[PDB]
Structure 1
Amino acid sequence: EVSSEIYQWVRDELKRAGISQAVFARVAFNRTQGLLSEILRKEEDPKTASQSLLVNLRAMQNFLQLPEAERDRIYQDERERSLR
């Protein structure tokens, strides 16, 4: 259900949109920066990923399927709250 390229997709998205891990972790799968940093460092194959990790990856995958304009609008608003 989760693509083996999810990690590559997240990295490309962060660079594309120019956003922090904090913002993406919050809007994409409702978690914090450190958790995403670790998730990205380990790059655990979805095929052997734990239930909690799959939940997180699936949420990310789903978010990425949203229109680019909508993802960007979502990031812009979260960044404002984050700055606060």
Structure 2
Amino acid sequence: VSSEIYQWVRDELKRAGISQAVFARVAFNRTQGLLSEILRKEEDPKTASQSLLVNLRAMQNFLQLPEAERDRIYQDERERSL
């Protein structure tokens, strides 16, 4: 898992114009508060619980998807929420 994962998520949130809640759900099937804590702590991927490392690689796996597919998934989750 890249040490850059944390800025790649923040850049992706800025770029997509998306909530922590929507990204957290589609990217790694977790809640808004967990992503908020994950982004604040920026814990060294090598120094991370397997639980947390699975989340980061779930996020990295999601972020390596085509921008077009990510943006479509974000829209489904919005209309599925709204």
TM-score range, shorter chain: over 0.9
Report the secondary structure of 2:46's partner residue: helix
Q: C-alpha separation between the residues in 1 aligned to 2:65 and 2:16?
A: 13
Q: C-alpha separation between the residues in 2 aligned to 1:6 and 1:54?
A: 11
Report how many aligned residue pairs link the two structures: 82
Unaligned 5+ residue runs, structure 1?
none
Offset at residue 81 of structure 1 (A)? 1.8
Offset at residue 51 of structure 1 (A)? 0.7
Offset at residue 47 of structure 1 (A)? 1.4
Offset at residue 46 of structure 1 (A)? 0.3
Report the TM-score, using the length of structure 2 for normalisation: 0.97
Q: C-alpha separation between the residues in 1 aligned to 2:78 and 2:32?
A: 13
Unaligned 5+ residue runs, structure 2?
none
Report the TM-score, using the length of structure 1 for normalisation: 0.95
* CA RMSD, 1 decimal: 0.6
Offset at residue 41 of structure 1 (A)? 0.7
Offset at residue 10 of structure 1 (A)? 0.3
